[PDB]
Structure 1
Amino acid sequence: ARRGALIVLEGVDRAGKSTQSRKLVEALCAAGHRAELLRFPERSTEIGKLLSSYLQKKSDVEDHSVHLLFSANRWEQVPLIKEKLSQGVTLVVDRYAFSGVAFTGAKENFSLDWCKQPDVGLPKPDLVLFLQLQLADAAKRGAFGHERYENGAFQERALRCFHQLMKDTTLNWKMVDASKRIEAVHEEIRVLSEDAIRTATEKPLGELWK
């Protein structure tokens, strides 16, 4: 039975990860694929609620602790991720380990290596789309939110970490010009995703960063 593809959406702030993720799943399903949407953090579990309270500033969490919770929040979904992929279901994921590393990695005294370790071993995405957008363009999309990390300076330190992670040639990274309209960005992502489901899947699901 042909496994599903694991597709991740990553990208700068307001670049359209959530919009594009919901649109990709809808369009794959409409074209007869079996596809479902996931996102991280997944706030409905016990850990997810801790992470949600942190991001909304309702609680403060030690930085190493919070990093590990974010990763744990991925590991708790691995049994489901692996089962859905083995059943032929393509999974479109709004943020994954890349955000985990880039966001803690933007903080002082957090090496990229330390930030990567908790996630080593996770299911490896068959495709990692990185939605790029210029600052001037992200502004036309509205004001920063009120949640933690939604600050220009901090966003720019996360972006440098993302660019380090993209030097990683074990991953099938694809850049997406997220400045275009919602529809045009969607068509670019869609075609890339059809291609990943079609080919990328003839190899077994890999393991991230190992």
Structure 2
Amino acid sequence: RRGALIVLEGVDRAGKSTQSRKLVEALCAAGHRAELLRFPERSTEIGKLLSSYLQKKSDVEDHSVHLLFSANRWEQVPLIKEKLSQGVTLVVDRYAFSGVAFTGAKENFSLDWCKQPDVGLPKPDLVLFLQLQLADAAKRGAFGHERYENGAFQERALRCFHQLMKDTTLNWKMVDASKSIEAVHEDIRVLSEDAIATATEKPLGELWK
């Protein structure tokens, strides 16, 4: 019976990476086959160009870089489909919603244009959005030095995330990411176990189509 495709999204410092790793751990301890994936996936050739751009070691024209982030996803599709088909649940730290939110926060990029490259990807069974006080999120240390890590940019991407949340065909769940690490974890684990039990029942969908 297939695994579920579970995505964690949220603004920076909302706890996506910590909860993603802890969810895989709890799922494996509850006897599921589960694995962690992340985007961008920095180890391929595309991913290294992307990693360079984000660290500001290089600049890349905005359209091209949007397309590189989408291709980075499509190159892992064969692996995603295979693992799900084998009953492995995949927990993914960011996906195409981050792709659309971060480019669409830039001037002159329509939401529509930014979604197209990602149309057709494996459609998540569950899209968790980790909500946190952008401020009460800055009290989570301090913006890193990477591109996009500043307040104003974060605010334009959060609006984009909110447009994408009006999709009713995507199973979006909000999570209050202000609680402790263990409490966020328990909320996430329960919605994920629920999605996994239903997933083995419907075919993997296609994103935005």
Contact 1:3 1:88 in 2 (8 A): yes
What are the superposed Cα offsets for residues 23-62 of structure 1, whole Å, 9 maximum, x if unpaired?
0000000110000000000000000000000000000000
Comparing 176-185 with 127-136, greater Cα deviation is found at: 127-136
Structure 2 residue matching 1:36: 3-state secondary structure: strand
- The alpha carbon displacement at 1:141 in A equals 0.8
- The alpha carbon displacement at 1:172 in A equals 0.1
- The alpha carbon displacement at 1:201 in A equals 3.0
- The alpha carbon displacement at 1:137 in A equals 1.2
What are the superposed Cα offsets for residues 146-176 of structure 1, whole Å, 9 maximum, x if unpaired?
0000010000000000000000001000000
Contact 1:103 1:158 in 2 (8 A): yes
Contact 2:2 2:199 in 1 (8 A): no
Contact 1:78 1:123 in 2 (8 A): yes
Contact 2:39 2:93 in 1 (8 A): yes
> How far apart, CA to CA, are the structure 2 residues paired with 1:19 and 1:129?
14
Contact 2:165 2:172 in 1 (8 A): yes
- The alpha carbon displacement at 1:71 in A equals 0.1
- The alpha carbon displacement at 1:119 in A equals 0.1
> How far apart, CA to CA, are the structure 2 residues paired with 1:152 and 1:15?
14
Query: 1:117 matched to which residue of 2?
Result: 116
> How far apart, CA to CA, are the structure 1 residues paired with 2:71 and 2:94?
14
Query: 2:163 matched to which residue of 1?
Result: 164
Contact 1:8 1:128 in 2 (8 A): yes
- The alpha carbon displacement at 1:135 in A equals 2.2
Structure 2 residue matching 1:7: 3-state secondary structure: strand
- Per the normalisation by structure 1, the TM-score is 0.99
Contact 2:46 2:68 in 1 (8 A): yes
Identity of aligned residues (%): 99
Contact 1:126 1:201 in 2 (8 A): no
Q: How does 1:4-153 map to 2 (within 5 A)?
A: 4-153=3-152
> How far apart, CA to CA, are the structure 2 residues paired with 1:149 and 1:114?
20
Consecutive unaligned residues in structure 2, runs of 5 or more: none
The structure 1 segments of at least 4 consecutive aligned residues displaced by more than 3 Å after TM superposition are none
Contact 1:132 1:176 in 2 (8 A): yes
> How far apart, CA to CA, are the structure 2 residues paired with 1:107 and 1:116?
14
> How far apart, CA to CA, are the structure 1 residues paired with 2:186 and 2:164?
25
> How far apart, CA to CA, are the structure 2 residues paired with 1:180 and 1:202?
32
> How far apart, CA to CA, are the structure 2 residues paired with 1:191 and 1:154?
32
> How far apart, CA to CA, are the structure 2 residues paired with 1:34 and 1:17?
20
> How far apart, CA to CA, are the structure 2 residues paired with 1:159 and 1:208?
20
- The alpha carbon displacement at 1:140 in A equals 1.7
Comparing 102-111 with 195-204, greater Cα deviation is found at: 195-204
> How far apart, CA to CA, are the structure 2 residues paired with 1:67 and 1:95?
14
Matched residues, number: 209
- The alpha carbon displacement at 1:13 in A equals 1.4
Superposition CA RMSD, Å: 0.5
Contact 2:3 2:200 in 1 (8 A): yes
What are the superposed Cα offsets for residues 92-112 of structure 1, whole Å, 9 maximum, x if unpaired?
000000000000000000000
Consecutive unaligned residues in structure 1, runs of 5 or more: none
> How far apart, CA to CA, are the structure 2 residues paired with 1:50 and 1:199?
38
- Per the normalisation by structure 2, the TM-score is 0.99
